[PDB]
Amino acid sequence: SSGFRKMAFPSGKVEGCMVQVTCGTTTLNGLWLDDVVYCPRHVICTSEDMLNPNYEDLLIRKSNHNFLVQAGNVQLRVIGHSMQNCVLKLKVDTANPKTPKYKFVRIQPGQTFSVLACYNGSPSGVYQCAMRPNFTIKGSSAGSVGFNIDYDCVSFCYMHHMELPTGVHAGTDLEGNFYGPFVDRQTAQAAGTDTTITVNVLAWLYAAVINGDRWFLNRFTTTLNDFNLVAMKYNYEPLTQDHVDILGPLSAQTGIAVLDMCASLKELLQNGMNGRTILGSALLEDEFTPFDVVRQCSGVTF
Amino acid sequence: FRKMAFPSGKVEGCMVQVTCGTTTLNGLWLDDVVYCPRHVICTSEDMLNPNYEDLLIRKSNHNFLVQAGNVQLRVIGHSMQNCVLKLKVDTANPKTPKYKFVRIQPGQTFSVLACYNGSPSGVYQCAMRPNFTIKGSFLNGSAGSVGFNIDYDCVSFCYMHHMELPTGVHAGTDLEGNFYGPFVDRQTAQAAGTDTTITVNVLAWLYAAVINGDRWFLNRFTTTLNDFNLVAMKYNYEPLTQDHVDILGPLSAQTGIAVLDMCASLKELLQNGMNGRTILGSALLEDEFTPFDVVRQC
Amino acid sequence: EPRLQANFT
Ligand SMILES: [Cl-]
Ligand code: NA
Ligand code: NA
């Protein structure tokens, strides 16, 4: 009933990659992999440029020595600079000896990852979050990154850029493509209406069963079409057949069919929890993926 | 408003595997000492009434198999301190961070690096409950995982994991091997006392909610400290002490809301529930953020 | 019963 918490990936492999990047009066975080430091391109903007920035214009103004990169207390020598989408790439004269095995991946809304929050290049905290269906992140500095680990391979999927007026965050993948209809400009922008990640709620109900929280199970089953009619009503994402399939493992480990569990969720949506809790929560949690549940309940290590 | 754990890299570099016989758990490698729970020297016949002094005197150094990654460390001495073993090894850990050992009090928060076979599975934030247990995810093989804070470049180790209690909550020691709470490292019948809500942390979290711009739950009332405790304890909340009132002083000054005025707000929230609303993304009153945590992340 | 959480085999 309590043995299931939001669990982040161990962050040590990423901590060894975080550096401080300064251009003028702007300081943010950079990601040092091989001989390149990745960071948001708006590091070349004052708070004044940010009103209507012309990024290629502001960047040709800059010599390599306009970028101060510090790895702990060592200054890194910048020997080239270029832009890819909304990411600046600073080539340095030294390859990071702590570079882990890594790749750059773009994730889908609903998928989860750990963010290593940093300030001035120093790792400050780590937390597990989901890419919302409206492509924002609910979280805590620009250039902090998000990642998953697979066994020894770090999959970098997110770099933080902007804070939105609702406090949610917007960012890019590591090739500088934004998640969501956002731009790196100080301007009027706002997240679209969010929705609940249905497949993740179901995964978390399975985690509840695995941990002995079973009061919401019932005799009934439903159909995809019938469930989605209810899902649309309560601002839940439609449940697709691919979603049913990835729940197969959990559906087997617990011996509870997905559409069987959908009947529980339908009932929970229509009638509430009636003063009860599930895994210590009065709300239906949607930031655990099916694999997140397996990873925590099976003790997968890295 | 997220629970944040500390970055775990400084602790990852200290985790090793310890095996004695056919029993295996995690160890913490700092300088030339590996610390681990003493019940690594138990067999399946030593689980109810182990005599650890007797089990240990039958062990030599080479009976302890310590693996750091692919390296096997040479144990050159061993002793028992309360409920932990200290294994002297012939190599200082080159990755040893600045560290200290601290014993914490209920209500304090810390990060847990859950490990199996000396390797990390993940990191989460938790609190020492008033009944001296913690609500972790800990599975078979997790003993020896540690809890820690890193407030200023220095790792403060405050918890080492030992055991699971029948309700699924977890019990362990400080790094000198003294248990938190009345528990013992035996599988004889034990149960945690009734758990209560950490009132001072709830109040800190309501201040956090005010700081992030939400005031819908305040009211125009105040309360005395004693009247507040008479009400709060009917909801299984911990008594609030003058010490706790002092702790909240900074957050009160930041918000302009007197501590006993926030206490009035909490009493009304206990009486009313949320009425379909949420505070900082939660439909329950959160009690695993300390006043220090809130000042930190705001 | 309470469980010591080493791995026993
Ligand atoms: Cl303390
Ligand atoms: Na059912
Ligand atoms: Na043994």
Residue numbers in the entry:
A (entry chain B): 0 to 139, 144 to 305
B (entry chain A): 3 to 300
C (entry chain C): 526 to 534
Q: Which of the paper's sentences describe this entry?
A:
The 1.9 Å resolution structure shows clear density for the TRMT1 peptide bound to the active site in one protomer of the Mpro dimer. TRMT1 Leu529 corresponds to substrate position P2 and occupies the hydrophobic Mpro S2 pocket, packing against Mpro residues His41, Met49, Met165, and Gln189.
TRMT1 installs the N2,N2-dimethylguanosine (m2,2G) modification on mammalian tRNAs, which promotes cellular protein synthesis and redox homeostasis. Here, we show that the human tRNA methyltransferase TRMT1 is recognized and cleaved by SARS-CoV-2 Mpro.
